[PDB]
């Protein structure tokens, strides 16, 4: 399982304390959040650009 996960063949993780394999049936449409993060970063950069022009 470790070898297969390291090879990106198996999308999951291992509970060593419980002796489990939890698969990765997750990662829904969160591209909206990444888009919002990029918007926030661009907005911060534009803030520093506009505010510091002259005054």
């Amino acid at each position: 399982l470790v070898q297969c996960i390291l090879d990106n063949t198996i999308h999951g993780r291992i509970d060593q304390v419980n002796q489990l394999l939890e698969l990765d049936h997750q990662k829904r449409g969160g591209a909206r959040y990444t888009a919002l993060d990029k918007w926030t970063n661009q907005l911060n950069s534009l803030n520093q650009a506009v505010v510091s022009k002259l005054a």
Partner: protein, 409 residues
């Protein structure tokens, strides 16, 4: 205490020029209970190649740190001066002869004399003078290789990089995509090895591994720049420390050309194979065992320790790659350390963001934290908005004070 892996006779006979002299000097400088043996072999075996000045330097350092048969050394010095003057006169005669072959042979003898004499300033002056005289690509190649060698001897890597870049960019971007692979042109492996040594010595391990892994055993039969054993050592250590799993797999284990280098030094091959197959107790134990030999090296020792830590850190990260909850006791056993030291190391790794995890010191379990993308996006946006409002309300006040032309006189 006992190790039959070192074939001293073959190792000594494999080297030519000043390389072995520097090698024995470097090992004997900081080796315990072996300096006397190295000095004995240096005094008894290597008497040629004009060993006079460094003998006096060794005498001076052993005397202050802890008559004579001067006729022979003076005669040899005067003979060298007379030979240099005769070669200069012959070079002037060749210049007056207006023959390209004559001047080329004169330059060849001058380069050979500079190689066997050790003088470098006049060599640099002659190279600067002759750089403007280029007619054929092959001669430029030989002179570039010679200047690369003298820059390596001078330990000046900027010139090495500049000449390498010039050589690569001269023939229409390295012959476009690439010609038929090396059949008998061993020059490309030599220049790649020189560039790898230069980049490794410049605290750039990743590029050194990238441009050193592209070597062929059939074309690495020049034991005057970098021996196959330490070439394999460098190509294994740098790749283990800097390459990720995918490119390490596709460039070391999958590479069949590097297999010969790996079997030449079985320790590095075993290290890489054990690291790749999630084995760290044996891998780190063998790394520690080989560290003593690695420190006695010349071109790797100052860069060994950091590399080692990098390797360990990589292992650490890999050990937690397939886990969302891991046992600290098993992790410590796999990394040959106590639970407290492992906890401290993982705390340091988490602090710098290399590992996204949290340590539970009650049950001694390393859990994996999952960043909530929604919550972190919301908090980052709110913080950005607050910063925007503060910046804008400061800018408005600045505009107000500049409109009033308010300033301190």
């Amino acid at each position: 205490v006992e190790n039959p892996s070192l074939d001293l006779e073959q190792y000594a006979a494999s080297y030519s020029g000043l390389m072995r002299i520097e090698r024995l000097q470097f090992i004997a400088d900081h080796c315990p209970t072996l300096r006397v043996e190295a000095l004995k072999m240096a005094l008894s075996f290597v008497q040629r190649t004009f060993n006079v000045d460094m003998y006096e330097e060794i005498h001076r350092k052993l005397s202050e740190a802890t008559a004579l048969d001067t006729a022979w050394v003076e005669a040899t010095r005067k003979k060298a001066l007379l030979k240099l003057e005769k070669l200069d006169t012959d070079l002037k005669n060749y210049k007056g002869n207006s023959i390209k072959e004559s001047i080329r042979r004169g330059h060849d003898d001058l380069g050979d004399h500079y190689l066997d004499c050790g003088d470098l300033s006049n060599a640099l002056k002659c190279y600067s003078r002759a750089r403007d005289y280029c007619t054929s690509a092959k001669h430029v190649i030989n002179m570039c290789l010679n200047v690369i060698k003298v820059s390596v001897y001078l330990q000046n890597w900027s010139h090495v990089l500049s000449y390498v870049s010039k050589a690569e960019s001269t023939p229409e971007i390295a012959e476009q995509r690439g010609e038929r692979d090396s059949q008998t042109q061993a020059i490309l492996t030599k220049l790649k090895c020189a560039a790898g040594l230069a980049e490794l010595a410049a605290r750039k391990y990743k590029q050194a591994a990238k441009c050193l892994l592209l070597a062929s055993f059939d074309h690495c039969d020049f034991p005057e720049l970098l021996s196959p054993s330490n070439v394999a050592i460098y190509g294994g250590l740098c790749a283990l420390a800097t390459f990720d799993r995918q490119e390490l797999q596709r460039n070391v284990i999958s590479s069949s050309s590097f297999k010969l280098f790996l079997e030449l030094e079985p320790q590095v091959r075993d290290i890489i194979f054990k690291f790749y197959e999630s084995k760290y107790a044996s891998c780190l134990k063998m790394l520690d065992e080989m560290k003593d030999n690695l420190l006695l090296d010349m071109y790797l020792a100052p860069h060994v320790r950091t590399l080692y830590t990098q390797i360990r850190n990589r292992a650490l990260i890999q050990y937690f790659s397939p886990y969302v909850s891991a046992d600290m006791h098993r992790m410590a056993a796999a990394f040959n350390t106590t639970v407290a030291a492992l906890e401290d190391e993982l705390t340091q790794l988490i602090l710098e963001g290399l590992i996204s995890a949290r340590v539970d010191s009650h049950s001694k379990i390393l859990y994996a934290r999952d960043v909530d993308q929604r919550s972190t996006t919301f908090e980052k946006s709110l913080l950005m908005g607050k910063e925007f409002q503060r910046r804008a309300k400061a800018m408005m006040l600045r505009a107000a004070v500049l409109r009033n032309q308010i300033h301190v006189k």
